[PDB]
């Protein structure tokens, strides 16, 4: 295993992967987990906020400012995607 940076294999965000604590709520979407601080677009690094417009395509984070229009299934009369909320997912393993 090479991708394992999550103090083992409990849970981590694809942006940084620095431990998913039970204390810090994490943003979960289709089938992936992210940190509320790591919830930023990969184009302009705009933080996605619950109540603000964001884009989630192929498991990637974009924003209203970039708005990848060349490959957005549903980008018709203004896509209305809103950033999800952070909830507690899984605790990280701590090797004592």
Return the residues of window 25-84 that contact Zn ion according to CB under 5 A.
Answer: 35, 38, 41, 43-44, 46, 63, 65-66
Q: Which is nearer to Zn ion, 10 or 96 (CB)?
A: 10
The whole-angstrom separation of Cα 46 and Cα 86 is 17
Least separation, in Å, of the C-beta of 73 and Zn ion? 19
The whole-angstrom separation of Cα 67 and Cα 70 is 9
How many amino acids of this chain bind Zn ion (CB under 5 A)? Answer: 12
User: Dihedral (C-alpha) 25, 10, 58, 28: value to the nearest 10 degrees?
Assistant: -20
Q: Under the rule (CB under 5 A), what is the footprint of Zn ion?
A: 13, 15-16, 35, 38, 41, 43-44, 46, 63, 65-66
């Amino acid at each position: 295993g090479s991708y394992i940076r999550l103090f083992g294999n409990s849970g981590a965000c694809s942006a940084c992967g620095q431990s998913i604590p039970a204390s810090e709520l994490v943003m979960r979407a289709q089938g992936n987990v992210y940190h509320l601080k790591c919830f930023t677009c990969s184009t302009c690094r705009n933080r996605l906020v619950p109540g603000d417009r964001f884009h989630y395509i192929n498991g990637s984070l974009f924003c209203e400012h970039d708005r990848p229009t060349a490959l957005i299934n549903g980008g018709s009369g203004g896509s209305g995607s809103i950033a999800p909320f952070p909830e507690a997912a899984l605790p990280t393993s701590h090797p004592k």
